[PDB]
Design an enzyme around this catalytic site. Sequence first.
Site, PDB file in Angstrom:
ATOM      1  N   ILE B  13       0.845  -1.134  -0.060  1.00  0.00           N
ATOM      2  CA  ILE B  13      -0.103  -0.029   0.223  1.00  0.00           C
ATOM      3  C   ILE B  13       0.977   1.250   0.108  1.00  0.00           C
ATOM      4  O   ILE B  13       0.785   2.155  -0.750  1.00  0.00           O
ATOM      5  CB  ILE B  13      -0.966   0.074   1.161  1.00  0.00           C
ATOM      6  CG1 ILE B  13      -1.972  -1.263   0.967  1.00  0.00           C
ATOM      7  CG2 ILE B  13      -1.674   1.210   1.317  1.00  0.00           C
ATOM      8  CD1 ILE B  13      -2.679  -1.177  -0.549  1.00  0.00           C
ATOM      9  N   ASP B  34      10.745   2.269   7.057  1.00  0.00           N
ATOM     10  CA  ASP B  34      10.339   1.066   6.927  1.00  0.00           C
ATOM     11  C   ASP B  34      11.303   0.249   7.829  1.00  0.00           C
ATOM     12  O   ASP B  34      12.179   0.694   8.790  1.00  0.00           O
ATOM     13  CB  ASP B  34      10.186   0.432   5.378  1.00  0.00           C
ATOM     14  CG  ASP B  34       9.661  -0.944   5.287  1.00  0.00           C
ATOM     15  OD1 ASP B  34      10.145  -1.963   5.587  1.00  0.00           O
ATOM     16  OD2 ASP B  34       8.706  -0.698   4.922  1.00  0.00           O
ATOM     17  N   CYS B 151      -9.839  -2.050   2.036  1.00  0.00           N
ATOM     18  CA  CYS B 151     -10.289  -2.489   0.820  1.00  0.00           C
ATOM     19  C   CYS B 151     -11.777  -2.993   0.378  1.00  0.00           C
ATOM     20  O   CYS B 151     -12.136  -2.377  -0.418  1.00  0.00           O
ATOM     21  CB  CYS B 151      -9.028  -3.254  -0.077  1.00  0.00           C
ATOM     22  SG  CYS B 151      -9.124  -4.855   0.928  1.00  0.00           S
ATOM     23  N   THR B 152     -12.023  -3.915   1.175  1.00  0.00           N
ATOM     24  CA  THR B 152     -13.298  -4.424   1.004  1.00  0.00           C
ATOM     25  C   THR B 152     -14.253  -3.167   1.266  1.00  0.00           C
ATOM     26  O   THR B 152     -15.591  -3.242   0.582  1.00  0.00           O
ATOM     27  CB  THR B 152     -13.359  -5.619   1.818  1.00  0.00           C
ATOM     28  OG1 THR B 152     -12.778  -6.543   1.669  1.00  0.00           O
ATOM     29  CG2 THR B 152     -14.982  -6.312   1.691  1.00  0.00           C
TER      30      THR B 152
HETATM   31  N1  LIG Z   1      -2.267  -5.427   0.596  1.00  0.00           N
HETATM   32  C1  LIG Z   1      -3.628  -4.900   0.434  1.00  0.00           C
HETATM   33  O1  LIG Z   1      -4.512  -5.460  -0.484  1.00  0.00           O
HETATM   34  C2  LIG Z   1      -4.288  -4.047   1.460  1.00  0.00           C
HETATM   35  C3  LIG Z   1      -5.598  -3.455   1.212  1.00  0.00           C
HETATM   36  C4  LIG Z   1      -5.930  -2.272   1.880  1.00  0.00           C
HETATM   37  C5  LIG Z   1      -5.407  -2.133   3.409  1.00  0.00           C
HETATM   38  N2  LIG Z   1      -4.307  -2.901   3.607  1.00  0.00           N
HETATM   39  C6  LIG Z   1      -3.687  -2.535   5.079  1.00  0.00           C
HETATM   40  O2  LIG Z   1      -2.296  -1.748   4.630  1.00  0.00           O
HETATM   41  C7  LIG Z   1      -1.542  -2.173   5.591  1.00  0.00           C
HETATM   42  C8  LIG Z   1      -0.136  -2.631   4.874  1.00  0.00           C
HETATM   43  O3  LIG Z   1      -0.783  -3.729   4.015  1.00  0.00           O
HETATM   44  P1  LIG Z   1       0.535  -4.352   3.048  1.00  0.00           P
HETATM   45  O4  LIG Z   1      -0.179  -5.229   2.188  1.00  0.00           O
HETATM   46  O5  LIG Z   1       0.976  -3.091   2.219  1.00  0.00           O
HETATM   47  O6  LIG Z   1       1.654  -5.007   3.992  1.00  0.00           O
HETATM   48  P2  LIG Z   1       3.334  -4.946   3.799  1.00  0.00           P
HETATM   49  O7  LIG Z   1       3.455  -6.241   4.574  1.00  0.00           O
HETATM   50  O8  LIG Z   1       3.337  -5.184   2.340  1.00  0.00           O
HETATM   51  O9  LIG Z   1       3.568  -3.716   4.192  1.00  0.00           O
HETATM   52  C9  LIG Z   1       3.906  -3.588   5.626  1.00  0.00           C
HETATM   53  C10 LIG Z   1       5.206  -2.759   5.552  1.00  0.00           C
HETATM   54  O10 LIG Z   1       5.498  -2.234   6.675  1.00  0.00           O
HETATM   55  C11 LIG Z   1       7.061  -2.359   7.184  1.00  0.00           C
HETATM   56  N3  LIG Z   1       6.884  -2.342   8.593  1.00  0.00           N
HETATM   57  C12 LIG Z   1       6.277  -3.021   9.418  1.00  0.00           C
HETATM   58  N4  LIG Z   1       6.456  -2.836  10.874  1.00  0.00           N
HETATM   59  C13 LIG Z   1       6.835  -1.452  10.799  1.00  0.00           C
HETATM   60  C14 LIG Z   1       7.326  -0.521  11.726  1.00  0.00           C
HETATM   61  N5  LIG Z   1       7.276  -0.733  13.119  1.00  0.00           N
HETATM   62  N6  LIG Z   1       7.973   0.638  11.358  1.00  0.00           N
HETATM   63  C15 LIG Z   1       8.262   0.876   9.954  1.00  0.00           C
HETATM   64  N7  LIG Z   1       7.840  -0.189   8.976  1.00  0.00           N
HETATM   65  C16 LIG Z   1       7.145  -1.186   9.362  1.00  0.00           C
HETATM   66  C17 LIG Z   1       7.195  -3.783   6.483  1.00  0.00           C
HETATM   67  O11 LIG Z   1       8.577  -3.819   6.648  1.00  0.00           O
HETATM   68  C18 LIG Z   1       6.440  -3.648   5.259  1.00  0.00           C
HETATM   69  O12 LIG Z   1       7.374  -2.934   4.294  1.00  0.00           O
HETATM   70  C19 LIG Z   1      -2.295  -3.318   6.519  1.00  0.00           C
HETATM   71  O13 LIG Z   1      -2.842  -2.714   7.650  1.00  0.00           O
HETATM   72  C20 LIG Z   1      -3.477  -3.812   5.796  1.00  0.00           C
HETATM   73  O14 LIG Z   1      -4.325  -4.405   6.372  1.00  0.00           O
HETATM   74  C21 LIG Z   1      -3.683  -3.804   2.606  1.00  0.00           C
END
Ligand SMILES: NC(=O)c1ccc[n+]([C@@H]2O[C@H](COP(=O)([O-])OP(=O)(O)OC[C@H]3O[C@@H](n4cnc5c(N)ncnc54)[C@H](O)[C@@H]3O)[C@@H](O)[C@H]2O)c1
Lengths: 334, 336, 334, 336
Positions: B13, B34, B151-152
Site C-alpha cells: 500500500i 520501513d 479495501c473491502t
Molecule cells: N495489500 C492490500 O490489498 C491491502 C488493502 C487495503 C489495506 N491494507 C492494509 O494496509 C496495511 C499494509 O498492508 P500491505 O499489504 O502493504 O502490507 P506489507 O506487509 O506489504 O507492508 C507493511 C510494511 O511495513 C513495514 N513495517 C512493519 N512494521 C513496521 C514498523 N514498526 N515501522 C516501520 N515499518 C514497518 C514492513 O517492513 C512492510 O514493508 C495493512 O494494515 C493492511 O491491512 C492492505
Amino acid sequence: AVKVAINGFGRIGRLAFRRIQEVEGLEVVAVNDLTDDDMLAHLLKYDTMQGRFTGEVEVVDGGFRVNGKEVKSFSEPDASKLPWKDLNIDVVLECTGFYTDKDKAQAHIEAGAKKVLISAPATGDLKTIVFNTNHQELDGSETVVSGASCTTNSLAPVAKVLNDDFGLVEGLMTTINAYTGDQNTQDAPHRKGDKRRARAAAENIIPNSTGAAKAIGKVIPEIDGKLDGGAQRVPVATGSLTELTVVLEKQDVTVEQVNEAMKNASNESFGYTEDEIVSSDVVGMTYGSLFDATQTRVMSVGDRQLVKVAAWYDNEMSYTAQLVRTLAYLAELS
Amino acid sequence: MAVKVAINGFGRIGRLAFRRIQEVEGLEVVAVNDLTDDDMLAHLLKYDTMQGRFTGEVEVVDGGFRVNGKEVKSFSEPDASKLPWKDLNIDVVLECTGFYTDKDKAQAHIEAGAKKVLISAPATGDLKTIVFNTNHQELDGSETVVSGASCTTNSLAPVAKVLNDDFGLVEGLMTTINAYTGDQNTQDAPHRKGDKRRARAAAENIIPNSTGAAKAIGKVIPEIDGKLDGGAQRVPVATGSLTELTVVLEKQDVTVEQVNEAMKNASNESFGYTEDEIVSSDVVGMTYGSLFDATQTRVMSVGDRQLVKVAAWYDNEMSYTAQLVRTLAYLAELSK
Amino acid sequence: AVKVAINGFGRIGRLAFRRIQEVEGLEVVAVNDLTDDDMLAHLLKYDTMQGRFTGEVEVVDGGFRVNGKEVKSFSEPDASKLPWKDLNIDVVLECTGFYTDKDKAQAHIEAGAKKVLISAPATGDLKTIVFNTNHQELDGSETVVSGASCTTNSLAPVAKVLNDDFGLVEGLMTTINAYTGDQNTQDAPHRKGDKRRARAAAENIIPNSTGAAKAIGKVIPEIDGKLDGGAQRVPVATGSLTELTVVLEKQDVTVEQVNEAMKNASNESFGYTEDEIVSSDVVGMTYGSLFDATQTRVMSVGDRQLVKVAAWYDNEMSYTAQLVRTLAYLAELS
Amino acid sequence: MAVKVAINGFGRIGRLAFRRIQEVEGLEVVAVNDLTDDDMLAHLLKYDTMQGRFTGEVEVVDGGFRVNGKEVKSFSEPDASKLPWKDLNIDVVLECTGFYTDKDKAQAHIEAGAKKVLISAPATGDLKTIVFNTNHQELDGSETVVSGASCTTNSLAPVAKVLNDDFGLVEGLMTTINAYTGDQNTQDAPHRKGDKRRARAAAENIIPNSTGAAKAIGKVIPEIDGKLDGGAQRVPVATGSLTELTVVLEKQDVTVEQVNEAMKNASNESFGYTEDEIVSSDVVGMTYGSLFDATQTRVMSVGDRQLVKVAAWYDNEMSYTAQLVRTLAYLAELSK
Ligand SMILES: NC(=O)c1ccc[n+]([C@@H]2O[C@H](COP(=O)([O-])OP(=O)(O)OC[C@H]3O[C@@H](n4cnc5c(N)ncnc54)[C@H](O)[C@@H]3O)[C@@H](O)[C@H]2O)c1
Ligand SMILES: NC(=O)c1ccc[n+]([C@@H]2O[C@H](COP(=O)([O-])OP(=O)(O)OC[C@H]3O[C@@H](n4cnc5c(N)ncnc54)[C@H](O)[C@@H]3O)[C@@H](O)[C@H]2O)c1
Ligand SMILES: NC(=O)c1ccc[n+]([C@@H]2O[C@H](COP(=O)([O-])OP(=O)(O)OC[C@H]3O[C@@H](n4cnc5c(N)ncnc54)[C@H](O)[C@@H]3O)[C@@H](O)[C@H]2O)c1
Ligand SMILES: NC(=O)c1ccc[n+]([C@@H]2O[C@H](COP(=O)([O-])OP(=O)(O)OC[C@H]3O[C@@H](n4cnc5c(N)ncnc54)[C@H](O)[C@@H]3O)[C@@H](O)[C@H]2O)c1
C-alpha cells in the site's frame, strides 16, 4: 461382475476407472477416447492433483493391462460405432461432455450397451440422480441416466436438510470453483463463445454460469424454482466450495440448529466437519458434499433472517465417488 | 506549497501510494520509513510483480533515494515516536505498516511532529472511518487521526448506499473473493495471529477468512448499521478482488434492470460501472474504488419474496490506494 | 525405541514426524516450536501438498496424542532451555533453520540431548551426510551432524557416478526449485536483504544462489571444487529438478552409457526412470534423487563434449526420507 | 502508401502484433482471420490478462471491428487458400495460427493472393529464418515466405553471436525456463500432438520439453551451426522466460567482467542489458528481443579449463512480437 465401458478417459473417466478398482461387482472392460494407448496408460499412472496410480499399468496389444486385467481401448469419436454388443457391455459411463442429452447418448444403446450413465447434467426424458439424495427414484429399467453435476452433488444434501427441517422459501448460491478443462490456458477464442472461459484459467477469478441451483428441482422436486446462483472459477486445480444464502419458514433460527441438522444427516455421501480446512484438504475425498460448520452464519434483523452455509466438494473425486455409487445401484437394480 | 507527506511502511500500500502521489500535484512524499535499507526500498519501488515497472528514475543516495531528481529521505525505525517529523515539517503521515491501526498508537506520529495521520486500514479508537465519495464530507478539519477503511469497505460502501437509498436495505450477507495478501504464509506454517487458515499456502488454496467490512459498514453508512455481515474467500490471484452482496429489500417487484440503472446513475471516479464480461486481471491497477459489474446482477423471486444479488470488482491494492490518496488530499486541504 | 525430539515443527519437522511413524525403533517424544498446540496439531493433520495425516491427532494437556502415543510440546526459542535431560532425548532433529552451525546446535547438547542432526547444511567441523552416498563416514562418536540440503541429496549420487565412471573435470548445475518459506508471499522487504527472495514467490521465475554444488566436497571429497551453480525458484509449491552440465575425462561418452551407469547405481535413495514425468509426480516420493533418463543430452564437436543430466527431487519428502534414514543409522551407533 | 498486413490467427502473438503495428508508421492491419466471431475478437483485443488493457476504442462493426477510427475486416476461414487476399490487396500475411509453419503450406496465402508471408514460428521447407538485428540483412526482397524464428531463438542469437565473435565458441548447452503457452492443457488430458508432458496441467508443474532453438541456431548464425543444443522447462508463470547457456570458449582465463562488457557493447533496441536483480514479472511487456542479465554471469575455472554460463530474459510474448514486427517492417520496406 457388471461389465462397464468408459467413454471419455478424461478427468472423470480416469478417476472413475480408479474408483471402480475398489468396488466389488464392477469391472471396466473397455475405454474409448481420441488418443493412443501410450497416452491413455500414461495419464492413468500419473495424475497431477490425484497422485500416482497404486498398481501397475502396461500397454498391451488391444489396449492396456491394469494389475493383471486387460482393458480394451478404442479411438472412435462417434459412439454408435463402438463394439459394445460384442463386448457384452452392461453400462457405459459417458464422460466425454459430447453426449449430454437422452437422444445423443442413445447412440451407445444402438451400439449394444444395455444402459448409459452420463457424468454431467443432461437434457431430455431422463432421471438426474444425486446419490443418497434421490437414487431411490431409480427402478432398474432406466436406459439413460444423468449423474447430475459436481455442484449439484454438493448442493442437494444441504438444500434437502434446509427444506425438510426449516422450510425453504428461497435462496441464492455462489460456487467457488477449481478451474476445469473447458477453460483456456491463455486468453484465446473459446469454442462455446464464452468470453470469460476464454481467459487464462490459472491467472483469474472468472465469473461463470451454472445450472446447479436453477435446476435443483430435477433432484429435489419440492424446492423446484426456489434456488438460483452462479460460479466463480479460481486458480486451484481441483477442490471447490458451494455457498448458499437462504430465506426460511422457521423463525429465530440459530447456527447451532442449522449445524446440528446437517450433522444428523451425515452419511457416506454427505460429510460433516468443524475443522478450519481449506480446499487442498478436500482433494481426493469421497464425500459428495462436505458440510463445513465453521462457515454457517445467521443474520437476524427484527423477525427477518438470512441463513448462509457452505459445503466443500472435490469437483473431481467427490463427483466421481457419487457417480460410481449411482453406477453400482443402477447395476444392482437390474 | 505542496502538502508534505511521510509514508510509514513502504510495503504494498505504501509503495503504491508513493507511485500514485507522483501522479497528483499538490502532494509530495518527503520521507519514507520501513524496517529495511535503501537498496531494498529503491528496488521494490522500481519493480512490482503485479503493478508493473515504475515510470520514473530511482537512484540511491546518502539519507535515502532520488526519484526523478527529487530527494526522498528514508529511515529504518520501528518506534514511530522516534521519527524526525518536526524537522521535516510533515503535514500528514500515511500509516501503512499494519502495526499502528489504532487511535492512541497512531498518536506516536503526532508526538514526533506530524500534523495528521491517515491510517491505511480499519482502526480502533475514537476516530472517523472514511471511504472517499461515500462519507469523506463527514471530515471537518478538526481531525488528527483518520482511518481510510479497508479495501473491502471501499468496494462495498457505494454499492450498499445505492441499494439502501433506492430500495431500502432490510438485511444482507456478503462474500468477498479476495486476492491473497502478505499476512498469509507461502507454505503451510504456524501463523503469527494463530489463524489456522491464514497459516496455509496462500497460492495453493481457497481459504475462508473473516472480514469486518460488512459488520462494520455502519461506521461509513450509519443508517445501515448492523444490517450487513459476511466473510472472505481468499484465492490464488496475487491481486484483484470481487465483492458479492445478497440482500433483502423494502421495495417489492425489483428487477435486474432497475438495480443496474440505479448503480450506473451513481457512478463517479470512485464508483465505476461495466457491462463487459471482465475477469480479475482486468481490474489490476484500476483507480476506481469499486467497479459495479452489471453482468453479475441477479434477482430471485418466489411469489412476493425477493433476494437481490450484486457484485463489484476491486483491485484490493490500486483501488484502495487510489481512494486512500483522494482522502489524503481532501484531509490535507482542510488544513490549508 | 530411540527417543527423538524435533526442534522446529515446520515443513521438514512435520514430515519427519510422519515418516518416523513407520520406522520401528524410532519415536518422537517431544516437539518444540513458537506456537500453540492447536496450530501444531492442525498443521500435522492437514498438509497442502503432502495430503491428510494418515493417523489421527488430538490436543491434550502438555502437547498432543497421535494414535495412542503422547507427544510433549514446547514453545521455547532458546534451545538451551529445553528439558532434553529430563526427557532422555537421544537425538534432536534440528529443523528450525536457526541452528545451522556446530556451536549453535551445541545448545541442544547442553540441554541434555545426546546427539543433534541438523536438517540443512551447517558450518563448523562436523560431518555432512547424504544417505547412501557417504553415511558410512559416520562411526557413532559424532555429537552434531548435518543431513545436507535437499539439492545436495539430489546431486550427490548423480555426481558420484559421473566421476567414478567417466572422471569429472568440471561442471555447472542449475536447480529448478519449488518455492519455499524463506520467500515472501508478495513483493516485500526481505529479512536477509535478498532482492529476489523479496519478490512474490508464486508469481515469478526467481534466480537465487545455492551452495549445493560449490560445497559438494563435504560429501564427495574427490570432486571438491569441481562443481558450482545456482537455483531458479518457480511457482510449484513442492517438487524440484537438478540439471548438471559437466566436462568429463573419458572420450566418446554416449547418452546410453550415462543412463546405464545411473540405473546400475540405483537403490532406495537413488531412483531411475524412463517415464516422461513432471514435477507433481515426485511430490511425496521417498528417493533422495530420481534420475530422469529422458533428459540426458550429449553435445560433441570434434573430440570435445558437454554432458548434461537431470534428477528430480521432492525438496520436501525426498530430503525428509533421506534425513530419517540418516537419523536411524546415526542413532544405531555409539 | 501504407503496407497492407493481414494477421492470420488473432491469438497471443497475432493480437500483440496488432498492438505493436499501431506504433509503426506505414504499416496497417486491414484484415484479421481466425475461427471465432467479432464479439470474441474485439473482447480479446480489449482485455489482456498479462499484457494489460488495450487503450484504444474497439467496437464491433459490420465487416469486422473498428480500432481508433480504423476499420479491420475479419473472417472465420480455417482454409488459408479460401481467404480474399487478392481482393484486399494484401502485401504481407502475418501467419500466427501455428498451423502453417511450413513453406509449402504457407504458400496457400500466396495462392490466395497475398504478396508475402511472415511466419511467427520456426518453419520447415526452403526459407530464411530471421532474428532482427542478428541476420535480417540476409533478406534481399525476393523472399516470398519467411520465418520469424522462435521466442527462444530471438533470446539466444544475440548472446551466441557475441560469445562467438569475442571469445570463439567451441560448444554449449542450453536450458530455457519458459512461461507456459497455449499448446499445453489446463488439466491433465490427451494431448493433440501426443506429447505426454504438454498433456499435463500447465499451471501446476515443472514440465520438461523440447525446443529446436539451440539445435537450429545455424539458420541464424551459420558460423556456429551444430555447436549448440538444449531443451526447455515450462513453469507456472503466464508469460516471461529465461534462457540459460553454458559454453566452452576458445579464449582462455575468461572473466565475468569480460563477458558482461562484451554483451553491453553489443546492446541495441533488440538486445538489452541489465545489472539489476530482476525476476520474470519484470520483463512482461518488454520490447527487447533479449535482455542480458549480467548478475547471472558465471565462470567456472578448474586449472586452465573453463565453463562460462550466461542468462538472458525474454517476454516470450512481447519480446518475440516486437522482433517479428521489426522483421515485418524491414521485409515490407524491401523493394520500394
Ligand atoms: N495489500 C492490500 O490489498 C491491502 C488493502 C487495503 C489495506 N491494507 C492494509 O494496509 C496495511 C499494509 O498492508 P500491505 O499489504 O502493504 O502490507 P506489507 O506487509 O506489504 O507492508 C507493511 C510494511 O511495513 C513495514 N513495517 C512493519 N512494521 C513496521 C514498523 N514498526 N515501522 C516501520 N515499518 C514497518 C514492513 O517492513 C512492510 O514493508 C495493512 O494494515 C493492511 O491491512 C492492505
Ligand atoms: N472435471 C470436473 O470437475 C467435472 C466434474 C463433474 C462432471 N464433469 C463432467 O464430465 C465430463 C468430462 O469432464 P472432464 O473434466 O473429465 O473433461 P476432459 O476433457 O478431461 O475429458 C474428456 C475426455 O473425452 C474425450 N473425448 C472428447 N470427445 C470424445 C468423443 N467424441 N469420443 C470419445 N472421447 C471423446 C477427450 O479426449 C477427453 O479425454 C463433462 O461433461 C463435465 O461437465 C466434470
Ligand atoms: N523446505 C524445504 O524444501 C527444505 C528442504 C531441505 C532442507 N530444509 C531446511 O530445513 C529447515 C526448516 O525448513 P522448513 O522449510 O521446514 O521451514 P519452516 O519455516 O516451515 O519451519 C521452521 C519451523 O521452525 C520454527 N522455529 C523458528 N525458530 C525457532 C526457534 N528458535 N525455536 C523453535 N522453533 C523455531 C518455526 O515456527 C517453523 O515452524 C531449514 O534449515 C531449511 O533450509 C528445507
Ligand atoms: N505465445 C508465445 O510465447 C509464442 C512465442 C513465439 C511464437 N509463438 C508461435 O506463434 C504461433 C501462435 O502462438 P500463440 O501462442 O499465439 O497461439 P494461440 O493459440 O494463442 O493463437 C492461435 C490462433 O490462431 C487461431 N487458429 C487456429 N487455426 C486457425 C486456422 N486454420 N485459421 C485461422 N485461425 C486459426 C486460433 O483460434 C487462435 O486464436 C505458434 O506457432 C507459436 O508457436 C508463440
